[PDB]
Amino acid sequence: ERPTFYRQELNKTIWEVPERYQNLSPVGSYGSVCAAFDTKTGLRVAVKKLSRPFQSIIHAKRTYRELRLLKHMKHENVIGLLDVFTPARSLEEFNDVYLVTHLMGADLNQKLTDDHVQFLIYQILRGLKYIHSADIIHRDLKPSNLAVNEDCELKILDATRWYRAPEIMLNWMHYNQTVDIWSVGCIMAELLTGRTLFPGTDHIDQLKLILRLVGTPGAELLKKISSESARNYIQSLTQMPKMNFANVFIGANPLAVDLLEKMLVLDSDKRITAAQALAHAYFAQYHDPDDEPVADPYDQSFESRDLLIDEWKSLTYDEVISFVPPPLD
Ligand SMILES: Nc1ccc2c(NC3CC3)nc(-c3ccccc3)nc2c1
Ligand SMILES: O=C(OCc1ccccc1)c1cccnc1
Numbered sequence: 001e002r003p004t005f006y007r008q009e010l011n012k013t014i015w016e017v018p019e020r021y022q023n024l025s026p027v028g029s030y031g032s033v034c035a036a037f038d039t040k041t042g043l044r045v046a047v048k049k050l051s052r053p054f055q056s057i058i059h060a061k062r063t064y065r066e067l068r069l070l071k072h073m074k075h076e077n078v079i080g081l082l083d084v085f086t087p088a089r090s091l092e093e094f095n096d097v098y099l100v101t102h103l104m105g106a107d108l109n110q111k112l113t114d115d116h117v118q119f120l121i122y123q124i125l126r127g128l129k130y131i132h133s134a135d136i137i138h139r140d141l142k143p144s145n146l147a148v149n150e151d152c153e154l155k156i157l158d159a160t161r162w163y164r165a166p167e168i169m170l171n172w173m174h175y176n177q178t179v180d181i182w183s184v185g186c187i188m189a190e191l192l193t194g195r196t197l198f199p200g201t202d203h204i205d206q207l208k209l210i211l212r213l214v215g216t217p218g219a220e221l222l223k224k225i226s227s228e229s230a231r232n233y234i235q236s237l238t239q240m241p242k243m244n245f246a247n248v249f250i251g252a253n254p255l256a257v258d259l260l261e262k263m264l265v266l267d268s269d270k271r272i273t274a275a276q277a278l279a280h281a282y283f284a285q286y287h288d289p290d291d292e293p294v295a296d297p298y299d300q301s302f303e304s305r306d307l308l309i310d311e312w313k314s315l316t317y318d319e320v321i322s323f324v325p326p327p328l329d
Pocket of ligand 2: 099100102104147157
């Protein structure tokens with residue numbers, strides 16, 4: 001049987017949650033999140049109430065997508081689902097979705113020491129290895145999507161353009177997983193210097209700042225570009241030379257500089273992968289081949305489906321029903 005719920009009004013919204021969760025306190029406003037005490041585990045959790053989860057086809061599918069993704073993620077450097085619930089007793093009543101996860105400290109968004117940079121980028125790459133092994137691309141990696149507790153343990157959660165790979169800016173539709181490695185490079189650079197590596201004011205400025213560091217594309221990359229207008233734009237630009245990173249990141253650990261060179265390669269095909277970066281010398285004190293696990297296969301065949309609102313809603317409901325809490329250990 002389902003547990004006993006209780007209503008209350010927090011900020012704007014009504015909140016109907018199981019008695020299990022106590023002392024709800026707002027932490028910000030996709031949906032709004034409350035901090036809470038979980039009486040079953042004795043841990044602090046974050047409860048997210050999705051807003052209007054089924055108000056349109058796209059909302060409906062987004063709701064399903066988010067629930068599917070969170071139910072899949074089981075890795076210490078990625079956000080996972082402690083609980084999901086609805087106060088509804090039937091599919092017909094069903095209109096609210098709440099998700100529960102570990103309350104984490106602040107987000108990553110100062111100049112940090114080299115050992116702090118090592119450990120944090122290590123953990124990001126370890127989560128990303130896992131995510132990527134599932135054929136999931138994060139696409140929106142940035143400091144505010146990284147939660148860090150006082151113990152410097154990090155979990156991947158969820159201007160965006162500052163961390164975006166140049167092939168996304170240029171609107172290539174066949175970009176792949178290494179768009180995330182680009183973002184890691186921009187994050188790591190920012191941690192090491194205390195400044196945004198590429199703080200473009202728009203998408204055009206963004207590219208200009210990028211190419212000025214990494215150089216304008218050579219013939220070899222230009223020959224893989226299918227869009228004539230895209231090729232025209234970059235081919236019409238002032239041909240910047242690739243900068244010496246050891247000069248640009250003056251004083252940083254030479255191994256950090258070398259990893260940055262391998263992450264921030266213009267050509268997506270020659271960018272280091274998550275698994276490869278983990279074996280890089282910069283992470284010598286943290287890397288362990290037997291504790292960098294891959295994920296179970298993830299079925300995202302639903303991404304290609306076009307369904308009705310009630311159908312996405314019903315798929316989401318099934319997923320709420322089949323949820324198995326993770327082991328209390
Ligand atoms: N194998 C590849 C590797 C890199 C690529 C890239 N990279 C952009 C220079 C940063 N851009 C594009 C592309 C194609 C059509 C429209 C817009 C962009 N394709 C690429 C194909
Ligand atoms: O804003 C937060 O809640 C987000 C969230 C995301 C997914 C499921 C439940 C809650 C949050 C995340 C990590 C630490 N503290 C709060």
